[PDB]
Write a protein of this length. Structure first.
Lengths: 96, 154
RNA sequence: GGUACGGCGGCCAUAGCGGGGGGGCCACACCCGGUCUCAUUUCGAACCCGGAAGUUAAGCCCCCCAGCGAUCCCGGUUGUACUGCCCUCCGAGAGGGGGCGGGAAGCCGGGGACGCCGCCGGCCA
RNA sequence: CUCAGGCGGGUCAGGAAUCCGCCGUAGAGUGCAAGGGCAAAAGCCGGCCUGACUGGACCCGUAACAGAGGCGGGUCCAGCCCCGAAAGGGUGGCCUAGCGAACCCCUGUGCCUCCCCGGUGGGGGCCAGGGAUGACAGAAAAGCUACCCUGGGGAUAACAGAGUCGUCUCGGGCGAGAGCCCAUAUCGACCCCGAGGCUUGCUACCUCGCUGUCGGCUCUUCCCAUCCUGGCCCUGCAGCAGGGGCCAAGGGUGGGGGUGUUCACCCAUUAAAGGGGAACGUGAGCUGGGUUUAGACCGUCGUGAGACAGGUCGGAUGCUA
RNA sequence: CAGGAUGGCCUCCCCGGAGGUAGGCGGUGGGGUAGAGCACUGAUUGGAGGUGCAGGGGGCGAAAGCCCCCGGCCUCCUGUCAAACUCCGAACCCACCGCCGCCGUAGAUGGGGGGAGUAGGGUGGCGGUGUAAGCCGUCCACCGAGAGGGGAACAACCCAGACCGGGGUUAAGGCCCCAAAGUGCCGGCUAAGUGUUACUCCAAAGGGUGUCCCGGGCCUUAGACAGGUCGAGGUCCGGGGCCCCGAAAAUGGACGGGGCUCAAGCCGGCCGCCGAGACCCCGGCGCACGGACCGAUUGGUCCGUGAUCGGGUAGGCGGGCGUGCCGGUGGCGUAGAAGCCGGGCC
RNA sequence: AUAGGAGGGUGCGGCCCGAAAGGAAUGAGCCUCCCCGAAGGAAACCGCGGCGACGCGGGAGUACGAGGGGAGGGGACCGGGGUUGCACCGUCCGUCUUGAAACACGGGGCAGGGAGUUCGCGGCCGUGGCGAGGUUAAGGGGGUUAAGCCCCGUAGCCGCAGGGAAACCGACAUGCCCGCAGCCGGGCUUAUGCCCGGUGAGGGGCGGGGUGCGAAAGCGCCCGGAGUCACGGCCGCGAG
């Protein structure tokens, strides 16, 4: 039986959280900032349901191309085409 | 050091990754030899393509003989003593010795192509082309024994 | 610059839980009383207001431990289980094996671990 | 403010009513499936309110890569507002389901417009909400054909072949148990390992511009897992006989009753009256009793046409090698 | 649902100018499969200890109640599990960076335009299902659309990817004859024609003082076993190689065949030779790209580079051959046109 | 008339034909001699290693080697063709199909005939004319044996201004930044060539403007001049 893709389709372990990590995260990730042209990983935080990108892109590295409101604009390369995402910084991580 | 790499297996039943690795190594056909460096990148390429090639360390004398016999210029012209002396001021033996010791690279002979198209070995390979040289075949790392194969293939 | 002083924080258990000893310059507490501010779906129990008669018993602060929990290193099991590539290598079969490249989990033994950092003030100087 | 569950105490009060302490990482709840997330909360109790709003921009998913009407979601600007001391939050439910084109019609609201011009009744147009297509990217929709016809298909069933052997026939391993004692004279529970392709089944590989069905008659040939005939071994083999096994395929394996029957049943003989393969051997050899067209009767089912792996009567067999 | 449309995959032309990434090394991040384990959820054999807990059997009752088996719940010990479990967890894969390597100014990556064909796939490994065959996906390796050399023939297996004429050496594999090359060499095993099978395309459980070996325990060279007398190794156990039994089919017949026994079989190795269109060399043709010359329209000559050009189905593009008629140009023919049979040359 | 394969392929040998158009007495098959020689490549003989098959060093990169040249002798065939012999290889042709020699379909032989044509509309390209303009249709005049040839014919069509359902309104003849080719200056460089700096048509990014929706912000479309006509070709839709 074919099943169409939904937001939380086959994310039982991907969006799960460690038992010792329960609760809200530390505020550093919430309050972090990035600059245009920076490269950032996408690590979704399950406990924060706003500004969440599609779990399809969880674990990918993108480029910051601006910031509207509180969310950052991340440009990513899916296959060969370009996709723009709006992600809250809590879901993002700097690339060292 | 400098490593000599010879392609053993043919162009059929080879998957795209290994095919591209060999193409970038410039081993497009069988019985073709190249000389490369001993850097980790090249070692990784050899590890990736280890099932269709053999390789080892090449002596200065064997390198000189290989250059003199199978070395070809642009246009498939022979490498002559006059040309080598004119463009470097040294004999082929000294050129090979310096190349092996690392003073300079083969690329410093103008209009020299990187591929040597060797001849099939005299008496053939002493092992099947389906097993590694360690087991008794003809593939994989060969060590300093690749000089004997180079001599049997000129 | 000293201080068994506090406030705001970072990593968020190698920091926790549970035990033993010690202290009150200042400071933090317990503690005393509910006119006013504030509140009990009753209760000054909590929250709020007004203070210092008393106490270091508790919180708090300093030192110690390996009982539970967590987690770091070393040795054994062990290059074991598993696995990427090639194979005219062995098997009736299931499945194994050679070469090159990676490599656990748990358990046993010995150490570690009763937190480490940032900013600014109080008291003394 | 902190839950479920538990321990100890307390008048009625008991396992369970309401209460007082201790433990308690969530073992509770969060409207509903499951997963994920939630502890000074997203849970329980209260105060105020209606951001479940208006005008718009961009982006992701359905539909990766890689095209999309419709739809869902995310990030924001402005307007008017709600809570709060403030920060901050609010474009429904903590996230993922609960729904739908064209044409036409109804409602709201301000505008444009109707053939030379102007007023009136009415109509047409733009924007927003609504009425549905579950076959859910959206026809308005019941059957028989055995009187059937056409174009195709071995892309696809029935007979036959091929693969497989669940099933079927046959064989083996251990030996509980039965055999007066004695597992193995004979039987061999439970369990386990195999052969054949002689029953049935499964697959859909060849054959639908045709490879003519079952049974019977005629005729030829082959296998042994041997029914009789030849030769032997063990015995719970006194003889006459029986039970089990081995070697052996030269020869034999017949005649009749009902039924189309293969088969099975029965009769009188017999040394015995064995089982099977050959396109389930053999229709350019035969017969045509059954199956399987077109006619007709009965039972049952259907409103009806009509149907029945339900019965019954009749129903064609081409040939110059 | 034997059919279409939008995409993916092929081909031809153009613009636009300086980068791109199939492979590798290191780094920054993501993951929960294999394996493993019981810390959550749910299972699972027995033993010990503690609990009236609204079990149930009984003894034990005017009622209040206790005395034991048994059921449940908790802790520990013991023996086992999970596709819809996880306190842990690889190989490996993915995104991004820096570098090596390769491609690109003879113009890549990328963008616009014209034309398609393709909507039945198969074999091979992996995953779910099924007794199996098979069905359905996944991997892109081979056939489809692929020559040549082999496995006896074979779609898929091995070598190998192919313009033409020559010379040589190797590949798969092979060397007793068919059949090119050894009745080749060293140590050992099999007595069954077992075998003479890389795979397509090869029967097991159980058993064997049949043989060749390797370990371990008891005795242990006039002292052991068979029959207190002999008088040298005996008696057991677990293993390894080959072979044997278990082993029955239908036209006469299959190691491809003959046949082969210190093999012409098998185990561990070695030494020569034979063998492709593959690889090397010589001469020739075409194609792609760049360059120089001449011809009054698409054309011609020559030079340079090619290990990184030369198979091909659907399909795309370029050039050329041939036929009837027309406008021009230059001609042939009764001293023999067209047509027809045989032959020479390009 | 003792021999097996889809009737053929490669190589040559018998028998036969060979005037012309192919070579050739200005000399064929053939015989003899000399030189160079790619990839490749021996052996005799001698010394040594291995139990052995055998191998190593000298001989030697020698003899030989595809092919490339020269000289002498002889004097008429070589190339080509018909049939057949031998060695090895080879299971016909078209077709659907995953798979054809197929026990899948179409295939006795020969000769002639036989299947992407025409119009209308739209999208592209190859070339040519004119160019902010392009082009004529119906038709008219001249000339002519004639329907050819010459001239006129502005109706119409498309382009020049876009936005909006409509009413209706109504824009850059360049204000900046990068920058390929090209040009200019300099350096390296025998020359082509390479690097740097400036300017840079075309191309790209901003800024500004018109209109629709909007309270506005802000968005969609459009704006700094290239179109039109013709011949040929590919495809799309409708006609058989």
């Amino acid at each position: 039986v074919q099943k169409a893709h939904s937001f939380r389709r086959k994310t039982r372990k991907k969006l799960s959280k460690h038992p010792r990590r329960r609760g809200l995260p530390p505020l550093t990730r919430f309050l972090q900032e990035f600059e245009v042209g920076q490269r950032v990983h996408i690590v979704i935080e399950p406990s924060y349901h706003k500004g969440m990108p599609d779990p399809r892109f969880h674990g990918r590295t993108g480029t910051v191309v601006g910031k509207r409101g509180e969310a950052y604009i991340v440009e990513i390369k899916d296959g060969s085409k370009v996709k723009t995402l709006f992600i809250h910084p809590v879901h993002l991580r700097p690339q060292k | 050091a400098k490593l000599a790499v010879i392609r053993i297996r043919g162009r059929v039943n080879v998957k795209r990754p290994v095919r591209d690795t060999l193409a970038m190594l410039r081993l497009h056909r069988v019985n073709h030899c190249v000389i490369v460096d001993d850097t980790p990148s090249y070692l990784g390429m050899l590890q990736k393509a280890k099932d269709y090639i053999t390789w080892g360390e090449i002596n200065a004398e064997t390198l000189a003989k290989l250059i003199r016999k199978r070395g070809r210029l642009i246009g498939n012209k022979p490498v002559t003593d006059e040309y080598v002396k004119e463009k470097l001021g040294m004999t082929i033996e000294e050129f090979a010795q310096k190349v092996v010791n690392g003073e300079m690279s083969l690329k410093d002979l103008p209009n020299l192509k990187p591929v040597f198209r060797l001849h099939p070995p005299r008496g053939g390979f002493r092992g099947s082309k389906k097993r590694s040289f360690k087991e008794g075949g003809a593939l994989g790392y060969r060590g300093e024994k690749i000089n004997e194969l180079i001599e049997r293939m000129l």
